[PDB]
């Protein structure tokens, strides 16, 4: 009963997170982040990057109910950006474009959340997370 009301809120959160992710993934600038890095082409990617992340994996994690707060989701967005900056050199413009897109993907995600997510709803999500940890 308590659990069922929690479950409605979390469903509303996932709908929102899916909507945000759809907007990021359909933006052409972020196409390179919409699928895992091809570790066969980018043969040194796993040597350098210990936790790969991308928007299709984020979508999977939403559907698996891994995110109980927007901040949990934003941590994975942040990881996408952090990975891109750790991996891509900063000398040629073709590399710089990827780093620029990574930082812009991060800023966009945070800006959409800050602009659109209801702060009271966010706090309720955080309470549901905390409740489940402690029950």
């Amino acid at each position: 009963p308590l659990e069922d009301q929690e479950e409605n809120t979390l469903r509303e959160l996932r709908l929102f997170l899916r909507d945000v992710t759809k907007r990021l993934a359909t933006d052409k600038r972020f196409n390179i982040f919409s699928k895992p890095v091809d570790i066969e082409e980018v043969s040194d990617y796993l040597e350098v990057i210990k936790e790969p992340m991308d928007l299709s994996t984020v979508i999977t994690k939403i559907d698996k109910h891994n995110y109980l707060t927007a901040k949990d989701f934003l941590k994975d967005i942040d990881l996408i950006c952090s990975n891109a900056l750790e991996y891509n050199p900063d000398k040629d413009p073709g590399d710089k474009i990827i780093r620029h897109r990574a930082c812009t993907l991060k800023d966009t995600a945070h800006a959409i959340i800050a602009a659109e997510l209801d702060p009271e709803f966010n706090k309720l999500c955080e309470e549901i997370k905390e409740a489940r940890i402690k029950r």
Partner: peptide, 12 residues
Amino acid sequence: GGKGLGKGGAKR
């Protein structure tokens, strides 16, 4: 940062 070979060019 920038530790990897890169996504472009001949060696990736």
